[PDB]
């Protein structure tokens, strides 16, 4: 394997009820441009191609929400990268400290994610 049409790719996707863009994995093309997304936290819902960002390793200087996986919510900016346990990490400068968070803990509030939807949007 190397590449496939959507299904299998790690991407970011909008969660419903006008939610933020969370990290996930495309599980199946539901149809009509809906693709079902296994969010990295284990959740599964369908999302339209317009609302999925597939070439989104979070750029440095991008503003993002930092998310301690238990639920603790804040926002900050990417100012570094790491790879650990074969998984992707970001030094978010958050409350004036450099703090390591992982992809699914570095999410894009919809307003932030819009600035990438214009390029990385499937639809």
């Amino acid at each position: 394997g190397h590449m496939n049409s959507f299904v299998g790719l790690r991407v970011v996707a909008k969660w419903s009820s006008n939610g933020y863009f969370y990290s996930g994995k495309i599980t199946r093309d539901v149809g009509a441009g809906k693709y079902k997304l296994l969010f990295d936290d284990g959740y599964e819902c369908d999302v339209l191609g317009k609302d999925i960002l597939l070439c989104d390793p979070i750029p440095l200087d991008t503003e993002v929400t930092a998310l301690s996986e238990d639920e603790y919510f804040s926002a900050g900016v990417v100012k570094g990268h790491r790879k650990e346990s074969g998984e992707l990490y970001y030094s978010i400068e958050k409350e004036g400290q450099r703090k390591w968070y992982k992809r699914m803990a570095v999410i894009l509030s919809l307003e932030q994610g819009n600035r990438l939807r214009e390029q990385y949007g499937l639809g």
Partner: peptide, 15 residues
């Protein structure tokens, strides 16, 4: 069993 609710932006979670 799985980990906690993470964030579900449909409502606030008051950090």
């Amino acid at each position: 069993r799985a980990h906690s609710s993470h964030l579900k932006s449909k409502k606030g979670q008051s950090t």
